[PDB]
Design a protein around this ligand. Structure first.
Ligand code: MER
Ligand code: MER
Ligand code: MG
Lengths: 265, 266
């Protein structure tokens, strides 16, 4: 089963001129399958899911309040900030409004609003370290963190590190029961992932995920799925500079089909 | 004076676009600021989803509903334009508040019908209108058939003045607790479907929240509130333009927005 998994991903890489990093882990973080699993890839927008977990932890701890109003001006509008732009005239979004927009719309301004509050990228890297992730690192805010310069180690993760971080957040007790359920529902309700991994999964699986798109052909999808009453965490990072945007979508869906084959056998 | 210019500019749009435009603007107490065809019936289409959310919030306020209660459903609840309902289908449910937020901010029809199932159907919606002093608005059918917009059909209709006063009652007239009122205000501001309609016609510094509608035979609607020059208003706009394109109808409602702007600013 694992040789077919590797061969099928290698075929996608060959024919699409792509690199595909995949890690699937069980709720304990034990490896189910993987490909280029410790190669570094740009996180791009996928880090917004750990960012929301950070926020949830501070609310859990009484260090933050979900309804606290975060004021801003037009300087905070950057490319792809649809909710931030809608709330601009009102003058604020709450911590939780901003987090939900970052997870479910990949709103960049809302992400940066939260980054300003925690003291910037170093604090997000600090959260990765707190939950046992020594690999993932945030260095810059949006959108420049998505620059994806070849060989740059800034703003990177590995498939296995991020998959284990997903498992830690959802299954390993990083959040309260209530906060864990909330972030799970946010991932299921994500509005940006209809054409990526969940398009390649069976329609009865419960799936939630966070997408990413970066320069130089990056297209990513991380999250969880429940298949045959068993829970998994998954991270998929791909680089395909020669494909169109729609073809990169199709590539991640095709990776979803390869994962399905492995799981169902 | 400025009301006459307001009437004159809207009739200009009506002639040029082969359209009929219903507008009512009221202050927080429901007193008329200005209007056009205010007592004419129009199909509500998706604009009723804002009053539906108010209905749900009132049940939460009164302790007869819980916002986190899970509403289970299967594939037969997915209808045309049910994006959130489709995403949550495998999980098996959508909570009361999840469905209400999808109905308001995405105009999700499946989520709307899920809430209608829980409250008793269209009769319960109409009962809520009557409870808050709206003797005009009526819901008769679920989505999407309630948006048929057959000419002269009285089902699933409101008037601009009736629904502007319903908006003001919900936002300013004490229909909801302070907490629920602020929440529903934020949901309207954060609506994802209105970027090209009324909001596109108001100044960038106005605080605006609204709920759109699109129906058959050329209906395009937008209801909500705006805050301008340190003053609060409720507004309902209903239009019928069967010969316009879909994008042209967005522009029609945005033009109504700047006619409203010209009125308010003098
Ligand atoms: C994050 O990776 C970047 C933003 N995140 C995503 C994404 O998650 O896919 C996008 S693309 C965004 C989502 N769907 C929208 C769309 O295609 N249309 C509405 C037309 C746009 C952003 C690039 C972040 C680094 O900018
Ligand atoms: C209600 O009037 C109908 C639905 N409500 C709306 C609306 O609010 O205008 C639509 S249109 C739907 C929402 N935005 C989508 C879109 O245009 N893009 C994805 C760009 C389409 C529905 C028709 C209800 C009666 O069906
Ligand atoms: Mg500024």
């Amino acid at each position: 089963e694992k040789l077919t998994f590797k061969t099928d991903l290698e075929k996608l890489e060959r024919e699409k001129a792509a690199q595909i990093g995949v890690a699937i882990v069980d709720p304990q973080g034990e490896i189910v399958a993987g490909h280029r699993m410790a190669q570094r890839f740009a996180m791009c927008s996928t880090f917004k899911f750990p960012l929301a977990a950070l926020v949830f932890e501070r609310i859990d701890s009484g260090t933050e309040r979900g309804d606290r109003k975060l004021s801003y001006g037009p300087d905070m509008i950057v490319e792809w900030s649809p909710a931030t732009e809608r709330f601009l005239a009102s003058g604020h979004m709450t911590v939780l409004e901003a987090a939900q927009a970052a997870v479910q719309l990949s709103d960049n301004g809302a992400t940066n609003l939260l980054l300003r509050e925690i003291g910037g990228p170093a604090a997000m890297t600090q959260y990765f370290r707190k939950i046992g992730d020594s690999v993932s690192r945030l260095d810059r805010k949006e959108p420049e963190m998505s620059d994806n310069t070849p060989g740059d180690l800034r703003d990177t993760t590995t498939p296995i590190a991020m998959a284990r971080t997903v498992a830690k957040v959802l299954y390993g007790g990083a959040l309260t029961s209530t906060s864990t359920h909330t972030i799970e529902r946010w991932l299921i309700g994500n509005q940006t992932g209809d054409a990526t991994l969940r398009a390649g999964f069976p329609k009865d699986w419960v799936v939630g995920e966070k997408t990413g798109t970066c320069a130089n052909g990056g297209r990513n999808d991380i999250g969880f799925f429940k298949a045959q009453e068993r829970d998994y965490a998954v991270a998929v990072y791909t680089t395909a500079p020669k494909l169109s945007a729609v073809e990169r979508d199709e590539l991640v869906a095709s990776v979803g089909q390869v994962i399905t084959q492995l799981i169902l056998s």
